[PDB]
Amino acid sequence: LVRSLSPGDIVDVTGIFLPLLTETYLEAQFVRQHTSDVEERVMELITSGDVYNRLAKSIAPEIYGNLDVKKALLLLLVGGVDKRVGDGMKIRGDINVCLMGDPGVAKSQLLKAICKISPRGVYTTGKGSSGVGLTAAVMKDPVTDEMI
Amino acid sequence: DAVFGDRVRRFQEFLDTFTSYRDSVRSIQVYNSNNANILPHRIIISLDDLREFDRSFWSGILVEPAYFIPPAEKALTDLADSMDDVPHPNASAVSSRHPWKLSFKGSFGAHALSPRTLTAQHLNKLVSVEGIVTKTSLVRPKLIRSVHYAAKTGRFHYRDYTDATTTLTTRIPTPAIYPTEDTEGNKLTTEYGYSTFIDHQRITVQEMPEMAPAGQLPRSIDVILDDDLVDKTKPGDRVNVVGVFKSLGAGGMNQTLIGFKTLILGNTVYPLTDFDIRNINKLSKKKDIFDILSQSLAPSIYGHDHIKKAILLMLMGGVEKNLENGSHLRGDINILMVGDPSTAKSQLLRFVLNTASLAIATTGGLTAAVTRLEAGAMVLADRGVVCIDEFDKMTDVDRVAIHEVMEQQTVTIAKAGIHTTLNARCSVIAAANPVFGQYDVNRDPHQNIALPDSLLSRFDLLFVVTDDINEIRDRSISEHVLRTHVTIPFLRKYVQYAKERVIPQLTQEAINVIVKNYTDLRNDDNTKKSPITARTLETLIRLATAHAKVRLSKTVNKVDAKVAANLLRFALL
Amino acid sequence: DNTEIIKSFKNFILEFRLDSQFIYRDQLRNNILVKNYSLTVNMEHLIGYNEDIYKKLSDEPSDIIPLFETAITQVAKRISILSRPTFQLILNSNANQIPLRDLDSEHVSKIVRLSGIIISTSVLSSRATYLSIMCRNCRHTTSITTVSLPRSCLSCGPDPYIIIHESSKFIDQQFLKLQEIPELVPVGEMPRNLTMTCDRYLTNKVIPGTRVTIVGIYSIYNVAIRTPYIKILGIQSFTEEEEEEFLQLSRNPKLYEILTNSIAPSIFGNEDIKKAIVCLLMGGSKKILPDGMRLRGDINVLLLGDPGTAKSQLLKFVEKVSPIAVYTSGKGSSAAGLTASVQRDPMTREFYLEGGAMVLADGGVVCIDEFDKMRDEDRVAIHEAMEQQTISIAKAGITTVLNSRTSVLAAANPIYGRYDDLKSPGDNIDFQTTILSRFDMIFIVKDDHNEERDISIANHVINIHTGNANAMQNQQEENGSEISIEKMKRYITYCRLKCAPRLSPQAAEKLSSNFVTIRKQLITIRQLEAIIRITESLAKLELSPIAQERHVDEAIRLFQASTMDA
Amino acid sequence: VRKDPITKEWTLEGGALVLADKGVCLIDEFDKMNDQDRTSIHEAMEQQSISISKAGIVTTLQARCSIIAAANPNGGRYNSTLPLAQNVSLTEPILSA
Ligand SMILES: Nc1ncnc2c1ncn2[C@@H]1O[C@H](COP(=O)(O)OP(=O)(O)O)[C@@H](O)[C@H]1O
Ligand SMILES: Nc1ncnc2c1ncn2[C@@H]1O[C@H](COP(=O)(O)OP(=O)(O)O)[C@@H](O)[C@H]1O
Ligand SMILES: Nc1ncnc2c1ncn2[C@@H]1O[C@H](COP(=O)(O)OP(=O)(O)O)[C@@H](O)[C@H]1O
Ligand SMILES: [Zn+2]
């Protein structure tokens, strides 16, 4: 089973939980990456047929008069197509949106709503939570001298 | 010993005479039967009931826990395994293994103590400790009973492991390497899946700085958490812990400063008058209630009535609003004061620390930096009010990171590695002085204090106070000082009563005036201390709700909006 | 044989009488009612009852004073019977406290009496007094009351015993550091610091910076390195003719001028500077309002001086006159950064809270030299201490607040070579203007060129270089121009302890008129308190029950000579 | 500071100023050193002694030395039209020594 997992993956791992305080670990047995039970819920919305406006009005139901902005958020949540051009080339299939505005226009509540809705959303303020909070760094392990 | 059985019988008699404990166990068993998640094997016993039934057993537990609690543990475990059939054969041999733990509650009398009031005379006894949790360690399981199996014989033999860190009485040292052969010499098999384990964690409870005496080093106690209550509080939580204050190791008796390692074997965790009510409610019926509580805010300080009114409203606070969508709404009110010195800026700032139920006074570290990450000054401010002096001295990082705390009332850690969200439900009051030595009324506060409008405007009320060179101000401001050459405890009870027992709600009648005034403010083009935005509308709701806290009413009325609008205009004109 | 010793102490406690009360038995009975197991015994009464038991205690206290502790435990047990743990004995003595420089090998293990100031205190630690042990081999159980466990069973192999924790008793221990009084510190000598340990209820009775009297057991424990220490047995912390002498002196009308001239007679001029220093030494008054506002009675003065204006001498003289004074220069303080600190003493391996210079001077005065060249972060603690009289120290997970009710005498060098009258002091003095806003009164000592002043100063230099300055001291004393430095120090402590004046309504309205007229011409409300402190300072010097309007004129003038000087 | 196994307490070893006691201490290029290094020299000439609190050692040593210092003006040339107090970074209190 070696060389199955990779760093940063989201997986469900099945195994045995094995051990005067005892130390515990898990012996991996089966690994998988990330349906009628939810197809019924999906069927209801497409049955109504209200797709763009309903979902664009669904995000932040407590913010006034930002339907055009919410529509851009709705597409950004969905995203485009990450076209693998081939021949070693690559074109991003994601949407980046900037929200300039005066103070008191609720342009930060949308930031909270986007992080809440998205399964992989991260909320950040200030100078990217400083330079150490932004980007990333390699840190040495004092136990094994390894850097992670 | 024979006396051990008699002590067990007393707890059995205790359970018989108080049906509440055993019927609760039966209710738990029925709940477990319906699920055949499983509830843990712990119940809570009131000490007052034990004291009223058997003082000696109650006193015996407090004074000699190692000689009185295990008899109670055996009595409860025996009753649990005998009250019903436990019909399932395979499940009974594993689920019923767990001994039934006990928890204590009630009045502790002389043993109701603190990390400082606790002394060595109370060691080897059961005590209740109240303090603040500073840090915790990783949860790890403790080996309790192992099961051995020989392949050639096909039968099971079990072995127990006990140590003084979890056992109430000092037993003979059990631990050793895991055995490999049985009595017959047959090679044994290690059955990992049939061994019984109990989770264990140690926490460090400390005396709060709120109550610590000045100039003396702190007192702290180590608390052990086991089994089900192994994780009940996070660092910073005000906790009440009951356990056996017990020593460990040796004080150098075998083989100089080394003392006996005194710590508490925690078994229970609880996170933290009528005449006063008859006085708080009674005194609110007069027509001028609000002015009374504004005068009692540092009465020796003359003038500044509106800022005292604003501070009182900040103490009362609004209501944070949550929705089924998962939204959270700001409910705290922030105030900032600006102008020339010698105007009691730090005096009222100091007074707030002397009045609030919880307050933190610091100066411009604010956020959690890096690993457990240390709790910053603004992080420790949850459910409290913050008093920051020299507010101009904030660094660039502090100035850009305070935005989330000011509005969202949340602290977000986004440092390399660990990411988490921490509650920052705090109201912030601060003061600042001009950089150039003197304030210039001909220029806006942004041009004087040098803090950006994007930071200054975040405060709901911005007060600019300057001592005029007029003689009439100088006469009163000096005479009031020279004149020095409803009670405050009642006021603090009023704040305690109002912030908890009454939650006002909105009403369309108040909306009729609040929206109208905000519409006028947006329409009015006259210069003001801040450009009007939607934030003022939220401020009016908070101020009206804060006034409703003073009036002690669940609804909102016209006068609540009238006062809120009038004061807001004062801070703007 | 030892039973007679136990009986003798039993009769001593039960039968000694003072003020018609059995004081030692009564106070032990009161302690039992309070439920604290402590007793205090005065040595001067021990010798009176019987010299034999006193002599035995003084000569071999190693085993006899355990007997006294056990005997009183029996006495307390007997007392409890009539009303139907090991008690502690505390020794107090009034005999002379031999200087710490004088203890020798002949006093080893003997009862000694010392005095000093507590500079540091450590954290508490657990110590054993009663134990129960069990053999791991044959399960033999017994009890034990540097004690060590038996190496062989008393019923099993070497070291068969283990400790039963749930059947044992323990006591609390604290380690402390003490050094000699500054009044006896030799010049060019580091004061003798001393290691002191106390146990049970003697712990946590003092804080660093406290002057105390010590009665204890001087002893030494372990090429042959040895370290002394004291086992603390007890800690303790004006004549009628002198009281009436100063009372008569209070009625002297020329006392203000006489005291002014006595302030550094070797210096020329600067007469009003001398008056300010007297007001600094006298200090104001502190009062507490019911709303939680505490009024600072301390007065702080800054002496902005040009180089060569004897600024070093001005602060140097004050330290020997003020009863509670410490000198600081170049960020140097009492082995700290002018504030409290937590340090680990390797001798006991424990962590100790250590008091800085501003900590030791609680209720006194501190002299700060080279004020313009100190660490800025130290100024912040000073700034809080200068106004709130508190110092805040944070260590790991604990923050502590320490009291510092100290008046500050400060001297500083201007930004340029000399103060320029064309500019505000905030642009002339070489440190933070925020601190400049905190001093009650600042003065600029001047160097105006004058013939007779310079010539008199010039001759004074040759007199020192010729040794005639020693004869000048006799000449000045014969002239009666100075009060004795020891007597003046006694007077400062006398007035600080006996008098606490209050302002009169006439003085208050006079101050109000002065303040209004000053601002009509123009000074902050903060400096109104600074002026008022001077009004209380003058009344305290005269020991008048209340301040008087006649104090206002000098108070206004001295402050006018300070603020309008810049 | 040096360790000593014979007595096990920290021992102190003197620097250049302690060596030149009853002698002369020469400081070439006096201006180029930092103010923290220069602050020690100032208190050396004033008190003729060294005061130090390091590694738990608090003591004073004799530093009776004479000083001869060479320096350079700002910019490497002396400004004849400005005073000495405005030709070097050396502060005036140190010049008075
Ligand atoms: N149209 C709107 N609907 C709902 N809330 C609003 C609206 N406009 C403003 N608000 C309120 O005002 C605040 C806007 O602040 P924020 O989102 O931080 O804007 P900015 O980024 O300009 O500071 C929010 O707390 C929000 O509750
Ligand atoms: N209205 C007032 N009533 C009484 N005292 C006042 C008033 N205004 C200012 N003061 C006095 O002025 C002093 C200035 O304190 P403060 O202005 O808080 O300091 P800072 O200007 O450094 O913040 C205080 O000690 C206070 O006693
Ligand atoms: N009014 C005065 N009375 C007596 N001595 C004076 C007077 N003015 C100056 N002096 C002499 O001038 C010297 C000043 O040196 P000092 O001020 O201590 O140096 P620094 O300014 O570096 O501290 C002293 O030695 C002192 O004897
Ligand atoms: Zn034995």
mmCIF file of C-alpha atoms in Angstrom, chain C residues 75-204:
data_model
loop_
_atom_site.group_PDB
_atom_site.id
_atom_site.type_symbol
_atom_site.label_atom_id
_atom_site.label_comp_id
_atom_site.label_asym_id
_atom_site.label_seq_id
_atom_site.Cartn_x
_atom_site.Cartn_y
_atom_site.Cartn_z
ATOM 1 C CA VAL C 75 0.791 22.326 75.642
ATOM 2 C CA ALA C 76 -1.671 23.055 72.834
ATOM 3 C CA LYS C 77 -3.002 19.491 73.048
ATOM 4 C CA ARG C 78 -3.523 19.941 76.792
ATOM 5 C CA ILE C 79 -5.331 23.235 76.143
ATOM 6 C CA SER C 80 -7.673 21.559 73.647
ATOM 7 C CA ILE C 81 -8.769 19.143 76.386
ATOM 8 C CA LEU C 82 -10.133 22.020 78.480
ATOM 9 C CA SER C 83 -12.086 23.311 75.469
ATOM 10 C CA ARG C 84 -13.857 19.939 75.207
ATOM 11 C CA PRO C 85 -0.283 18.814 64.077
ATOM 12 C CA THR C 86 3.146 20.137 65.080
ATOM 13 C CA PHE C 87 2.906 23.759 66.205
ATOM 14 C CA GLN C 88 5.411 26.454 65.255
ATOM 15 C CA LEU C 89 7.486 28.611 67.611
ATOM 16 C CA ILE C 90 8.502 32.180 66.728
ATOM 17 C CA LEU C 91 11.304 33.974 68.578
ATOM 18 C CA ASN C 92 11.470 37.751 69.022
ATOM 19 C CA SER C 93 14.287 39.578 70.788
ATOM 20 C CA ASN C 94 15.107 43.181 71.663
ATOM 21 C CA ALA C 95 18.869 42.717 72.079
ATOM 22 C CA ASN C 96 21.349 44.474 69.812
ATOM 23 C CA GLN C 97 21.444 43.165 66.239
ATOM 24 C CA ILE C 98 25.133 42.434 65.657
ATOM 25 C CA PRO C 99 26.307 43.741 62.255
ATOM 26 C CA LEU C 100 26.365 41.182 59.455
ATOM 27 C CA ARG C 101 30.078 41.945 59.007
ATOM 28 C CA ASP C 102 30.762 40.762 62.574
ATOM 29 C CA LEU C 103 29.443 37.183 62.579
ATOM 30 C CA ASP C 104 32.300 34.698 62.925
ATOM 31 C CA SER C 105 33.026 31.005 63.447
ATOM 32 C CA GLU C 106 32.400 31.332 67.199
ATOM 33 C CA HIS C 107 28.721 32.092 66.488
ATOM 34 C CA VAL C 108 28.256 29.077 64.189
ATOM 35 C CA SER C 109 25.093 27.196 65.250
ATOM 36 C CA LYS C 110 24.486 29.855 67.929
ATOM 37 C CA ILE C 111 21.466 32.127 68.233
ATOM 38 C CA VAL C 112 22.188 35.378 66.388
ATOM 39 C CA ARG C 113 20.305 38.633 65.852
ATOM 40 C CA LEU C 114 20.563 40.585 62.602
ATOM 41 C CA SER C 115 18.888 43.434 60.742
ATOM 42 C CA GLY C 116 18.609 44.289 57.075
ATOM 43 C CA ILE C 117 16.376 44.842 54.066
ATOM 44 C CA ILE C 118 14.655 42.042 52.147
ATOM 45 C CA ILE C 119 15.803 42.265 48.531
ATOM 46 C CA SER C 120 14.278 39.080 47.096
ATOM 47 C CA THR C 121 11.741 36.358 47.884
ATOM 48 C CA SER C 122 11.340 32.948 46.264
ATOM 49 C CA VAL C 123 8.416 30.676 45.446
ATOM 50 C CA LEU C 124 7.016 28.278 48.034
ATOM 51 C CA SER C 125 8.216 24.676 48.271
ATOM 52 C CA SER C 126 7.022 21.555 50.071
ATOM 53 C CA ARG C 127 8.967 20.035 52.968
ATOM 54 C CA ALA C 128 8.291 16.836 54.894
ATOM 55 C CA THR C 129 7.690 16.686 58.643
ATOM 56 C CA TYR C 130 5.900 13.352 59.211
ATOM 57 C CA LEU C 131 5.990 10.260 57.007
ATOM 58 C CA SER C 132 4.700 6.694 56.849
ATOM 59 C CA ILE C 133 6.672 4.012 55.012
ATOM 60 C CA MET C 134 6.036 0.411 53.975
ATOM 61 C CA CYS C 135 8.437 -2.368 53.004
ATOM 62 C CA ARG C 136 8.018 -3.565 49.423
ATOM 63 C CA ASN C 137 9.189 -7.048 50.437
ATOM 64 C CA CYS C 138 7.346 -7.973 53.649
ATOM 65 C CA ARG C 139 4.750 -5.144 53.806
ATOM 66 C CA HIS C 140 5.941 -3.882 57.194
ATOM 67 C CA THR C 141 4.288 -0.545 57.995
ATOM 68 C CA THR C 142 5.800 2.115 60.257
ATOM 69 C CA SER C 143 5.950 5.896 60.614
ATOM 70 C CA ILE C 144 8.825 8.390 60.722
ATOM 71 C CA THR C 145 8.622 11.802 62.381
ATOM 72 C CA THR C 146 18.609 15.282 56.518
ATOM 73 C CA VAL C 147 16.212 12.481 57.441
ATOM 74 C CA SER C 148 16.516 9.399 55.242
ATOM 75 C CA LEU C 149 14.623 6.145 54.893
ATOM 76 C CA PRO C 150 16.150 3.039 56.519
ATOM 77 C CA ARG C 151 18.470 1.011 54.300
ATOM 78 C CA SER C 152 17.273 -2.258 55.877
ATOM 79 C CA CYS C 153 13.841 -3.420 56.976
ATOM 80 C CA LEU C 154 12.821 -3.041 60.622
ATOM 81 C CA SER C 155 10.535 -6.104 60.586
ATOM 82 C CA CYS C 156 14.223 -7.725 52.482
ATOM 83 C CA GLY C 157 17.216 -6.431 50.542
ATOM 84 C CA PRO C 158 18.729 -2.952 50.376
ATOM 85 C CA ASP C 159 16.373 0.044 50.436
ATOM 86 C CA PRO C 160 13.132 -1.974 50.816
ATOM 87 C CA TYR C 161 10.873 0.890 51.933
ATOM 88 C CA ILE C 162 8.456 3.036 49.927
ATOM 89 C CA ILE C 163 6.515 6.146 50.934
ATOM 90 C CA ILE C 164 2.787 6.130 51.691
ATOM 91 C CA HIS C 165 1.638 9.546 50.478
ATOM 92 C CA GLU C 166 -1.941 9.395 51.779
ATOM 93 C CA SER C 167 -0.662 8.938 55.366
ATOM 94 C CA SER C 168 1.951 11.697 55.621
ATOM 95 C CA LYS C 169 2.202 15.368 56.578
ATOM 96 C CA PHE C 170 4.143 18.187 54.925
ATOM 97 C CA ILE C 171 4.944 21.856 55.533
ATOM 98 C CA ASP C 172 5.663 24.931 53.424
ATOM 99 C CA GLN C 173 9.077 26.563 52.977
ATOM 100 C CA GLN C 174 10.214 29.904 51.547
ATOM 101 C CA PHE C 175 13.735 31.120 50.774
ATOM 102 C CA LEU C 176 14.626 34.810 51.055
ATOM 103 C CA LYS C 177 17.567 37.159 50.517
ATOM 104 C CA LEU C 178 18.609 39.943 52.895
ATOM 105 C CA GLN C 179 21.345 42.578 52.871
ATOM 106 C CA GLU C 180 22.542 45.115 55.414
ATOM 107 C CA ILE C 181 20.972 48.542 55.962
ATOM 108 C CA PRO C 182 22.352 51.260 53.629
ATOM 109 C CA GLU C 183 23.012 53.478 56.668
ATOM 110 C CA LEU C 184 26.005 51.249 57.497
ATOM 111 C CA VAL C 185 27.243 50.486 53.956
ATOM 112 C CA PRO C 186 30.957 51.341 53.640
ATOM 113 C CA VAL C 187 32.167 53.369 50.681
ATOM 114 C CA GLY C 188 33.656 51.300 47.877
ATOM 115 C CA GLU C 189 32.125 48.123 49.316
ATOM 116 C CA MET C 190 29.368 45.827 48.090
ATOM 117 C CA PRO C 191 26.742 45.388 50.844
ATOM 118 C CA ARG C 192 26.770 41.920 52.388
ATOM 119 C CA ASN C 193 23.863 39.873 51.040
ATOM 120 C CA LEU C 194 22.607 36.963 53.122
ATOM 121 C CA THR C 195 20.608 33.805 52.419
ATOM 122 C CA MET C 196 17.609 33.298 54.711
ATOM 123 C CA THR C 197 15.065 30.468 54.837
ATOM 124 C CA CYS C 198 11.745 30.326 56.681
ATOM 125 C CA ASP C 199 9.067 27.659 56.972
ATOM 126 C CA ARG C 200 5.385 27.117 57.849
ATOM 127 C CA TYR C 201 3.544 30.339 58.813
ATOM 128 C CA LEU C 202 6.587 32.625 58.577
ATOM 129 C CA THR C 203 6.310 32.400 54.779
ATOM 130 C CA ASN C 204 4.853 35.219 52.653
#
